[PDB]
Amino acid sequence: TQFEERHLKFLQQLGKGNFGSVEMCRYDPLQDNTGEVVAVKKLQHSTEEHLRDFEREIEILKSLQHDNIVKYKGVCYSAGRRNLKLIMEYLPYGSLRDYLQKHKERIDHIKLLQYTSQICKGMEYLGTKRYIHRDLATRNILVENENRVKIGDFGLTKVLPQDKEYYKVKEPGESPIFWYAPESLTESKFSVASDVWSFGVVLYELFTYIEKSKSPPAEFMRMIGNDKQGQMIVFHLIELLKNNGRLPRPDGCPDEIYMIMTECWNNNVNQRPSFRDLALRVDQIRDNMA
Ligand SMILES: N#CCCn1cc(-c2nc(Nc3ccc(C4CCNCC4)cc3)nc3c2CCN3)cn1
Numbered sequence: 001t002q003f004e005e006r007h008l009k010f011l012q013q014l015g016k017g018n019f020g021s022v023e024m025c026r027y028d029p030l031q032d033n034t035g036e037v038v039a040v041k042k043l044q045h046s047t048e049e050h051l052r053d054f055e056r057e058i059e060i061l062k063s064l065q066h067d068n069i070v071k072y073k074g075v076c077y078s079a080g081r082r083n084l085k086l087i088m089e090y091l092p093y094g095s096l097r098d099y100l101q102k103h104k105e106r107i108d109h110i111k112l113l114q115y116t117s118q119i120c121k122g123m124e125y126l127g128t129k130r131y132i133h134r135d136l137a138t139r140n141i142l143v144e145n146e147n148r149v150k151i152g153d154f155g156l157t158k159v160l161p162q163d164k165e166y167y168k169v170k171e172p173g174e175s176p177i178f179w180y181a182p183e184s185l186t187e188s189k190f191s192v193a194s195d196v197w198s199f200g201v202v203l204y205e206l207f208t209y210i211e212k213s214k215s216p217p218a219e220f221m222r223m224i225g226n227d228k229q230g231q232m233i234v235f236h237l238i239e240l241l242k243n244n245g246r247l248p249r250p251d252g253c254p255d256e257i258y259m260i261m262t263e264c265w266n267n268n269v270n271q272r273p274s275f276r277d278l279a280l281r282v283d284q285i286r287d288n289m290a
Pocket of ligand 1: 014015016017022039070088089090091092093094095139140141142151152153
């Protein structure tokens, strides 16, 4: 937790997310080019609301210790408490979204299911802490090596109240609506079960291999008609999901995997599977394939 700004050497931008950025830096306190490369998240507009959210995000990440969750290393700030920065381990292959698109000819279904199982175990761990991730997507999953992925960003993550199994929240700005459960679109309710709905969309993403015209936004915009503007998009999306319109089975996806997706996409919040059942089903399919 003891990083001093004078010793962080900027190398390049790695990502520009909900509104902050992640940079590759070398932490080199001895100024001899032996320090380690780390990933550094900062806010791009340090309002007090975004800053309190960022402090809570930092506390959430520091409290998580799991093989499939990116490692907290520390914090760094300038004089006062301003320009707060989160220091994390650098993962060399980048986001799963980009990795999968780049290496799709070398990544088979058994490997996708290995990633799926690691994401499920990460999410189950979050749930044991009563955290709701709210932004599960392959762009927020990072690749440490070809056999290990990690949930890599927690900017929207909330803690459940102790008396309730959901958290109601609507932030100004724009929301990844094409990953959202219907009750998150209509009532702004987020829960473990809405994370399960999004997990279904992640599984869809993996099995499309991030083909550009097959993305959830592309498919949903086609299904509702590309005329829709602004708020009409969300309205028509809600109505589409209410009539059980769903993303199609991806090319080459086995029906057993598509059935996992469609069970995650249950309109009835209480009938969606748990992350532990998802991991068991995925691991049984993996074992059958091997
Ligand atoms: N999740 C999430 C969304 C926000 N976000 C977080 C990161 C991040 N990226 C990395 N590593 C990383 C990233 C990109 C590359 C590209 C570089 C050009 N050549 C191809 C590969 C390589 C390595 N390491 C991390 C983080 C967080 C903590 N550790 C990136 N975006």
